[PDB]
From a paper:
Recognition of peptide-major histocompatibility complexes (pMHCs)5 by the clonally expressed αβ T-cell receptor (TCR) mediates T-cell immunity. Combined with biophysical analysis, we demonstrate the molecular mechanism for antigen discrimination by the ILA1 TCR and model the mode of cross-reactivity with these APLs.
To investigate how these ligands adjust TCR interactions to tune affinity, we solved the structure of four APLs (A2-ILA3G8R, ILGKFLHRL; A2-ILA3G, ILGKFLHWL; A2-ILA8T,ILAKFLHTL; and A2-ILA8E, ILAKFLHEL), included our previously published APL structure (A2-ILA8R, ILAKFLHRL), and used the ILA1-A2-ILA complex as a model. In contrast, in the A2-ILA8T and A2-ILA8E structures, peptide residues 5–7 were flipped so that Leu-6 acted as a secondary anchor and Phe-5 and His-7 were in more solvent-exposed positions. Modeling demonstrated that this alteration could lead to a steric conflict between TCR β-chain residue Gln-96 and the C-terminal residues of the peptide. However, the position of peptide residue Phe-5 in A2-ILA8T may allow for compensatory interactions with TCR α-chain residues Asp-91 and Tyr-98, which are not present with A2-ILA8E. Furthermore, the smaller Thr-8 side chain in A2-ILA8T, compared with Glu-8 in A2-ILA-8E, would require smaller modifications in TCR docking.
Residue numbers in the entry:
A (entry chain A): 1 to 276
B (entry chain C): 1 to 9
C (entry chain B): 0 to 99
Write the structure that this text describes.
Amino acid sequence: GSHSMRYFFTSVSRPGRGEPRFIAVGYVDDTQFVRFDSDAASQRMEPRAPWIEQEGPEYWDGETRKVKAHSQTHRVDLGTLRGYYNQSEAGSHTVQRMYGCDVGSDWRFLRGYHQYAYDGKDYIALKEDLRSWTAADMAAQTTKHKWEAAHVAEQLRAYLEGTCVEWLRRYLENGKETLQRTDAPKTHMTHHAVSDHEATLRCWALSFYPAEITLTWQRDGEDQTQDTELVETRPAGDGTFQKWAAVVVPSGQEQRYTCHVQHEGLPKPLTLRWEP
Amino acid sequence: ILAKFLHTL
Amino acid sequence: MIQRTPKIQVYSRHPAENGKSNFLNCYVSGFHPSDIEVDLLKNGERIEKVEHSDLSFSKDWSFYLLYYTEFTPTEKDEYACRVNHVTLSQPKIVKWDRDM
């Protein structure tokens, strides 16, 4: 399957005093591998996976230097965006950036990403061709003019199609025994009597990686969305994920219902039925 | 690894 | 000035059995802005050995966080997650239901 590398950057201005709070996280697929937080003591890019620990102290020097230049760029942005939107200094405000590359199952360049939001709303994003920009409003149109002038898109394209892709490959190779493994979900079904005539079947997917999954209920071979409830897929806290889906059914009719589970780690889709 | 430069808006 | 109220799930990392060491999680998502207060509670009282994940966010720019602490469930103990956020009138409390 495909793989992604992504970085996520959040900066929250502190109006009373001092510079903005800045947090950066790096991910390979659904696995966080690095981070920086401006309010931590180390003031360094820190490892969050055991496999990135094998990088030498130059790597940590280079990634610390870069991530600090990143927080300064976002510090300067908060102040430009305050003026652009003509906002006061009493208000806290937030910028978020995300960038990265996706590779297919041959690990070649598939797709690149660089997006930027202000106060939780789109501001500017690199289009999927990587040579032009989507600006959401006129302030962002001003930024787009400046970045066209200074050939920014083209630097990004070198990074997204080149550096990002080569470092992704290298991580997949050094985190191999976790990143290139896929953990199929451990599934089961529970029953709970609502009342004397209604019953609830809940289908569980536990312990799976990566996070993408689908759970579908059927009745007598047909999709059923009515009288069901999905939960958002949630992290277990040990690198794996969970999710469940449930359906309310009339008592005695449990065996009409089947739960179907699809996941990259399951050669074929799985089918659960209450009746043992 | 991170991008080498990040331009101000 | 666009505010999103956090969703909350409270759950264990493993199938919950009594006298067996585990992890109580409170996963908070879909909120903006990022400032948020999350506490785990044990029979109402706040637990202090509580760690949490590094702030990140979804493709709609809403934030999410995992708060967790080690615990061993027992027959009588009741657990809960307590969230406050500019968005809420006062704290939303969600009980740990084991089958969820």
